[PDB]
Amino acid sequence: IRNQEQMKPLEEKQEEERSKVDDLRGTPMSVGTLEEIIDDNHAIVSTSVGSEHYVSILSFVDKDLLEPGCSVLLNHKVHAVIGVLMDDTDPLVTVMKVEKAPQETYADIGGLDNQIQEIKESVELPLTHPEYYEEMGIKPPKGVILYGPPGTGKTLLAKAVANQTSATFLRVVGSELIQKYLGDGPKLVRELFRVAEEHAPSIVFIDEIDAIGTKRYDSNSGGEREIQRTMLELLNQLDGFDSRGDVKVIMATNRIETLDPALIRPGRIDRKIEFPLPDEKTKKRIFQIHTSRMTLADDVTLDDLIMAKDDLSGADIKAICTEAGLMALRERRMKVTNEDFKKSKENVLYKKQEGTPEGLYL
Amino acid sequence: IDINDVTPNCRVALRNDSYTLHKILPNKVDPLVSLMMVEKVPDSTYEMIGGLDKQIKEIKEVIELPVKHPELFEALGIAQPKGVLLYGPPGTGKTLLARAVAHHTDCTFIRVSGSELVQKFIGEGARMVRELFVMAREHAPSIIFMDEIDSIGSSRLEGGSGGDSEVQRTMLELLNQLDGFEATKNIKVIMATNRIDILDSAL
Amino acid sequence: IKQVEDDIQQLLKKINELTGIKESDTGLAPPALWDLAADKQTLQSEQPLQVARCTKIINADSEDPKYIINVKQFAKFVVDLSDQVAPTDIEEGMRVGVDRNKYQIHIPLPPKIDPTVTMMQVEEKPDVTYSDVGGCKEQIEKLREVVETPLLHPERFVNLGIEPPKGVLLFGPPGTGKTLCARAVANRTDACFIRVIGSELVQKYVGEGARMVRELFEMARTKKACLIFFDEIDAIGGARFDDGAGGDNEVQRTMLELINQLDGFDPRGNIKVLMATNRPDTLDPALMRPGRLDRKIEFSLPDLEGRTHIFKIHARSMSVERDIRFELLARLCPNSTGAEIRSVCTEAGMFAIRARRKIATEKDFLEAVNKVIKSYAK
Amino acid sequence: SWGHEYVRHLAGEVAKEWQELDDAEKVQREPLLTLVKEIVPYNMAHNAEHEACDLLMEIEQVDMLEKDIDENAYAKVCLYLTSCVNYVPEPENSALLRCALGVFRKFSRFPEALRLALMLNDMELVEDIFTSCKDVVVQKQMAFMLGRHGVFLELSEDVEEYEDLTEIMSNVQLNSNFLALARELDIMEPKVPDDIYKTHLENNRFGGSGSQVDSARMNLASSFVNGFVNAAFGQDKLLTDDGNKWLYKNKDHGMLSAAASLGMILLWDVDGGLTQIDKYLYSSEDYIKSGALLACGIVNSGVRNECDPALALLSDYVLHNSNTMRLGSIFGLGLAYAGSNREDVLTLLLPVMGDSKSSMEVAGVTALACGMIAVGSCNGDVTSTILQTIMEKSETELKDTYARWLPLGLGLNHLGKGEAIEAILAALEVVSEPFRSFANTLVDVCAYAGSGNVLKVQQLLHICSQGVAVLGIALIAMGEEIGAEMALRTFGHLLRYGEPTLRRAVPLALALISVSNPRLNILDTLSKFSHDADPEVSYNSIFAMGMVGSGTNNARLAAMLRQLAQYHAKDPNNLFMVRLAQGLTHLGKGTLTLCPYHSDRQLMSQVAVAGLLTVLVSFLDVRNIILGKSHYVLYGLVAAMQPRMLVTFDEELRPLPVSVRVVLLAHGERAELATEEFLPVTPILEGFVILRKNPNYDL
């Protein structure tokens, strides 16, 4: 009954309002742009029509949804605001894909275990535990650096981590920020930061660059100016605003001794993560998972191929199997033999080396 | 007419004093890049030029069979191969072989010229490399030939690093993520070179 | 339940506004809407400009009564008798006044010393106050005297007949509290902190760069009492004397343009400039020279006692057991600036968290030094 | 079982079925009732208090609660049940509080009975708690805490003007049976507490303000602020000397005010204060005569003793022709009786009430004067007079302002009152007024101490589809927790109506809640309301802001005062309002405060809210819609005052310092979150307390 009472005057009032908007809404409706916001009940507008008319805003749309430089709808002869335009373009920034929860996990690699705890404690752990950060009173590191011969576990570990962590992953290719155009490169780094802030919490994966390698002793040079001009703005963004979790940074570089200590800045980055070289046991572990996928046979001697191997990371190993698997496929058999493994192990050995040895230190 | 009836990117008739859609015309495309040349039919075949005979089976077996038939591979337990590189004496007939392959594969041949992706206009180059990938997916299956790193000589330039390889390198990284978030592809990358010294350490 | 109420809210506002638009529609009207983000009991009647947008321009003058001032590509039309009252201040245009170009057209409001259009970061008051003081201690003492004191007690300086500097310079590594210090005074001093990134000001096409420098200064003048924070000016700060060799000229033009405004006819006003350099050496003698740059405020290797104050700041958040003393360790530890001193502490809390303890320990501290000693050397 | 679903399943199931019937069935009889009881102590032992507490809700007897426990703390169980009551069901009656009150006492948790007793304080409770006390320590500790701010033993010293609640002490004094002492009684109705407050105010001081200056508008503001700032101690010498130049210059309401300000300095001195005023009161100018009357009233406040019979003067005026003087004596008289109901004051007021005053004197504000007194005890006489004036509508429709006041007066008389309101409700509902419909929700809410109900919120939308509906909201949020969430919701509806009356009323309602804890977000919305169209709305807003910061002197309070200062001349009225604020800010001196929430009991103070509410609608004439009212109402602010300080007396007239942990004060200054190093032996309490550890620490 209380409802009925509100309802009796309301229904008509409800219709009347809809009639009133329709009068404004009436075709056509021209897009135009709000130049700037003059807070003493004014604003600057640029019209590509002709007439402009200073109006009071409707109550559906407010000025709190108006931003400077925004697109809005104007009528073509009473030039008034029906609504703000709701059609926005593509992020124009440098190469990015955003992905929520990727397929892969970190249970597939093995024997690498220690490194895996390091990223764990930094990134994953505060999300899991508020109050452990409160006791200590501090943030886990803003960002980490993963360093090794290009992604054989660096790349693997990142993919895995995004699923775990359950926030948006954005992967940016850093070389692509470099442009030989005066405006372009700086605009991009500032758009990259802009994009982060909206999507927060978010993970930033920075793929290695050439441009983080050079600082010299000048702060800018008559050489390629842009690479350092850009390098600086990376720093300004970082040392201007610290995140505990709003942005998490994964940085990647082939060698970290290329980097600059300016770039690190202690108290943002405290963690430097190093992939050990191939260690003999590890090779067998990594392998056992790769063979499982594939056909296997009772004439395979798993150790013998691993033993024959020395200083080869998981990628070549993943590769050997794939190569061999192709040979088999040509034979139109799904049975694997020793022979297959031998030719593939030889091809990859042939290609990496032509050097001479520095051993025999005994 | 109602809004379900329209499908984006149609040429249409709008009235001028009532501003409603009287009719919809046929459809329309756009060149965002300063050179669009896509070939859905080829300029080459097997008997395009002869003496290729030893090579035809070898490329074929590498490229066609996984795209045509994914099921056999899946069953065996191997991952799809991402991209292929061909090296040999300049533009003898090498390129032709790629175009023969796209025809057989029954896909689009998309030649993207690397240097045409970068603009002195602000931001347009950065947007361009990324933008192309999304297009191919709607177009899928497709062949992305990186054009301008070796050609017959139909199109200027043989070789180039740091902006034919560098844009191509980017593609390898986009694909690495793709490989993690899917398990069947239909996007092949074709690189052509003569030189082994145009190849970066990353490559 | 809520819905009934919301509908009633649209409708009541609508009826009053429809009457007002019908009325405003007659005789036409200025740029097209009202946005409020101040108060309605303070309303300006001077509005910013550098070009004159006109839409009608109704006025009172004898030689004609609806005079116009444009410069626009199409309709650059102007007064029919020069210098006769036209805009009605900022009536029917909201920035109608005068054109920078000139056609001997009336000026009720200037084309310079205005905020106009901008791309700016203005950053309302911070919250930080003391967070690395101890060796940042000297830098604080001087910065207050230069920035704060003239604004607090100007009347005193006049009696004496002394005028305070216009700019101070900051150097050493950023994010060590060199950076903090500028925000920490900004919050205390209560004057708008305006952040311009010099690197951004750099543009793809010439003359634009100068234009920007100029715009900044016009806004700066209007507001009197403000701080211009220049983030790592060296991009368009000095290095450079070589006089071009291919667009080392374009960046040099900006550097020279700034000098003109500083050395020029303007005077200081209540405007303060904070400059940020890496090593000050880079910068050119013109940038260094008195009659703009006078005080250079420095950073330093922090004394032992100092380190302890920083640690003391940190120890309020961090659960401790005080029966051990950090200063003894600190003498043994590498001498290093403020940022490493907070970082070792921060590292210390983690070890606890793994240990499954809630209070600090002597043990944690030993560990931190080995990593940190390694981290500078990469 | 003994602690599983099983036990809880059986007991609750037997209970719920039995209870409904109004019979003793098969499912239970008296030994079956004992089987329900057995499940409650097992759960207590297990410390599965959640199961136990719900069983206590279901059995629907609090007799069972007592039966369970004959060992262990009574107090711990009950508190868990009391919280559980407000959360899950939304309770409707004041029964649940009253039942709750007894259970704390057995174990000797008399501070909790005291915590709970205040707000919704009934004539029955004060007596119930007292009967139970037979410990010397507890007895003395109540006497201090009731002394601080009475409302049934007022702050009266020796003049009896009540319907007896003072006589419990008289009877027990003859032959001690609950330990009422001759000494104890001074604390209980306060001479010595009132004296101590006065000394603190006198010591701490705060110097002169303004100069003589020129202009009428500026003179008035200056004399007004001077009088608040210098609220205690004789520095009145400066005004009196130059009484030609200063005081006279003002005309209209302002000359009355100017005179009245001497009363402000005099505040709390009964003897010297009233007498000095009397010289100017008889003879002199007609303005000086009125302005004095107002001044006698302010001095007289917060006590019943006198030295200038206000009743005598008021009586005389009905007989003569002095209509102008009479208005003012009644405001004066309203301050003087200070929250004490008496049939005599009611008789005296009644012929003046009876006549229509709206243009005979440009006011009929007299309802506010009647109101301020009528907070404290409900009698038949009072009830009957208010009902009849509303019923007539012979003064409840003449000016629209009056039309809110007479209905509001009913609610103020019924504030915090129990079972007695049910009789009235029926009478109210039968006569029809636009006002009365809002009023149905409002009569219940003042008596019950709030009621948020979804159905209640909705009824409010239907009537809308006026001041009286809106003020009531503020009560419900002050009350319960569930009442708070519903209020926020209720006020959302108000913001949607753009209608001008609705718009005006809402900032006051916010102001009333947010003065007990000043907070930064509620103040930004009132600042917006100030800047929107219409003068009348803007005035109500600037006032709201002034109220909200009122708490700890010059704290967050400074930022809110500055905020008023920026729009101190967007109207000439604004300029006056803002000067008034500066006066109010230095008025406290850290001896007194305004904040309905004190941290002596940690709860709200029934009296404090009532003071703030009467001033709130119409401080000034120039405020809101200008129908011809008054400016007098402003003096009313004294009523709201609550002292918050730590003073310890280890006998009850012999102070001894205590070591303060949360500082190191026992006279002057103030302490946030007062705590003692040696706290009572088991009736553990802060604020004004006896320490029975009796510590020999000295400052």
UniProtKB/Swiss-Prot annotation, chain A:
**Keywords on this record?**
Acetylation, ATP-binding, Cytoplasm, Deafness, Intellectual disability, Isopeptide bond, Lipoprotein, Membrane, Myristate, Nucleotide-binding, Nucleus, Phosphoprotein, Proteasome, Ubl conjugation
Q: Where is the composition biased (Basic and acidic residues)?
A: 8-25
Q: Which GO terms describe its molecular function?
A: ATP binding; ATP hydrolysis activity; proteasome-activating activity; RNA binding
BP GO terms, sorted: proteasome-mediated ubiquitin-dependent protein catabolic process
Reported effect of changing I250T?
Answer: In BKAH; uncertain significance; contrary to the wild type, it fails to rescue eye defects in Rpt2-null Drosophila
N6-acetyllysine PTM positions:
K180
Q: What is its main location?
A: cytoplasm
> What is the annotated localization of this protein?
Cytoplasm; Nucleus; Membrane
Crosslink (Glycyl lysine isopeptide (Lys-Gly) (interchain with G-Cter in ubiquitin)) position: K159
Q: Topologically, how does it sit relative to the membrane?
A: Lipid-anchor
Q: Which residues carry this modification: Phosphotyrosine?
A: Y361
List every position bearing Phosphothreonine: T356
Q: Does the keyword Membrane apply?
A: yes
The record's disease note says: Birk-Aharoni syndrome: An autosomal recessive disorder characterized by failure to thrive, severe developmental delay, intellectual disability, spastic tetraplegia with central hypotonia, chorea, hearing loss, micropenis and undescended testes, as well as mild elevation of liver enzymes.
Give the similarity note.
Belongs to the AAA ATPase family.
Subunit structure of this chain's protein: Component of the 19S proteasome regulatory particle complex. The 26S proteasome consists of a 20S core particle (CP) and two 19S regulatory subunits (RP). The regulatory particle is made of a lid composed of 9 subunits, a base containing 6 ATPases including PSMC1 and few additional components. Interacts with SCA7. Interacts with NGLY1. Interacts with PAAF1.
Task: Report the protein name in the record.
Answer: 26S proteasome regulatory subunit 4
**Encoded by which gene?**
PSMC1
UniProtKB/Swiss-Prot annotation, chain B:
- Specify which residues bind ATP according to the UniProt entry for this protein: G88, P89, P90, G91, T92, G93, K94, T95
Write down any Gene Ontology CC term: cytoplasmic vesicle
One annotated GO biological process: negative regulation of programmed cell death
Coiled coil regions, renumbered to chain: none
Q: Which residues carry this modification: Phosphoserine?
A: S18
UniProt key word Acetylation: yes
Keywords in alphabetical order: Acetylation, ATP-binding, Cytoplasm, Nucleotide-binding, Nucleus, Phosphoprotein, Proteasome
Q: Is Cytoplasm included in the keywords of this UniProt record?
A: yes
Q: Which residues carry this modification: N6-acetyllysine?
A: K120
* Cellular location(s): Cytoplasm; Nucleus
- What terms describe the molecular function in GO for this protein? ATP binding; ATP hydrolysis activity; DNA-binding transcription factor binding; general transcription initiation factor binding; proteasome-activating activity; TBP-class protein binding; thyrotropin-releasing hormone receptor binding; transcription factor binding
- Outline the subunit composition: Component of the 19S proteasome regulatory particle complex. The 26S proteasome consists of a 20S core particle (CP) and two 19S regulatory subunits (RP). The regulatory particle is made of a lid composed of 9 subunits, a base containing 6 ATPases including PSMC5 and few additional components. Component of a complex with USP49 and RUVBL1. Interacts with PRPF19. Interacts with TRIM5. Interacts with NDC80. Interacts with PAAF1. Interacts, in vitro, with the thyroid hormone receptor (in a thyroid hormone T3-dependent manner) and with retinoid X receptor (RXR). Interacts with ERCC6.
Membership in a protein family: Belongs to the AAA ATPase family.
Q: Can you name this protein?
A: 26S proteasome regulatory subunit 8
Organism (species): Homo sapiens
- Gene name per UniProt: PSMC5
Q: Which residues of the full protein are shown?
A: 103 to 305 of 406
From Swiss-Prot, chain C:
Database matches in Gene3D superfamilies: 1.10.8.60, Nucleic acid-binding proteins (2.40.50.140), P-loop containing nucleotide triphosphate hydrolases (3.40.50.300)
Entry-linked InterPro entries: 26S_Proteasome_ATPase, AAA+_ATPase, AAA_lid_3, ATPase_AAA_core, ATPase_AAA_CS, NA-bd_OB-fold, P-loop_NTPase, PRS7-like_OB
- CDD domains named in the record: RecA-like_PAN_like
Q: Where does ATP bind?
A: G172, P173, P174, G175, T176, G177, K178, T179
One GO process term, biological-process aspect: proteasome-mediated ubiquitin-dependent protein catabolic process
Q: Which SMART domains match?
A: AAA (SM00382)
Primary role = Component of the 26S proteasome, a multiprotein complex involved in the ATP-dependent degradation of ubiquitinated proteins. This complex plays a key role in the maintenance of protein homeostasis by removing misfolded or damaged proteins, which could impair cellular functions, and by removing proteins whose functions are no longer required. Therefore, the proteasome participates in numerous cellular processes, including cell cycle progression, apoptosis, or DNA damage repair.
Q: Which family does it belong to?
A: Belongs to the AAA ATPase family.
Q: What is the designated name of this protein?
A: 26S proteasome regulatory subunit 7
> What organism is listed for this UniProt entry?
Homo sapiens
- What gene name is listed for this protein? PSMC2
Swiss-Prot record, chain D:
GO CC annotations on file: cytosol; extracellular exosome; extracellular region; ficolin-1-rich granule lumen; membrane; nucleoplasm; nucleus; proteasome accessory complex
Where are the residues of the annotated region Required for interaction with UBLCP1? 524-694
Entry keywords, A to Z: Acetylation, Phosphoprotein, Proteasome, Repeat
Residues bearing Phosphotyrosine?
Y42
| Gene Ontology MF term list | enzyme regulator activity
Q: Which residues carry this modification: Phosphoserine?
A: S209, S211
Q: In which tissues is it expressed?
A: Found in skeletal muscle, liver, heart, brain, kidney, pancreas, lung and placenta.
Residue stretches of each PC repeat: 257-290, 291-327, 328-362, 365-399, 408-437, 508-539, 558-573
Name a single GO biological process: proteasome-mediated ubiquitin-dependent protein catabolic process
Q: Which residues carry this modification: N6-acetyllysine?
A: K399
User: Can the keyword Nuclease be found in this entry's annotation?
Assistant: no
| Domain of life according to the entry | Eukaryota
UniProt keyword Repeat, yes or no: yes
Description of how the protein assembles with itself and partners: Component of the 19S proteasome regulatory particle complex. The 26S proteasome consists of a 20S core particle (CP) and two 19S regulatory subunits (RP). The regulatory particle is made of a lid composed of 9 subunits, a base containing 6 ATPases and few additional components including PSMD2. Interacts with RPGRIP1L. Interacts with CRY1 in a KDM8-dependent manner.
Q: Which family does it belong to?
A: Belongs to the proteasome subunit S2 family.
**Protein name (Swiss-Prot/TrEMBL):** 26S proteasome non-ATPase regulatory subunit 2
> Source species, please?
Homo sapiens
Q: Which gene encodes it?
A: PSMD2
Shown residues in whole-protein numbering: 153 to 908 of 908
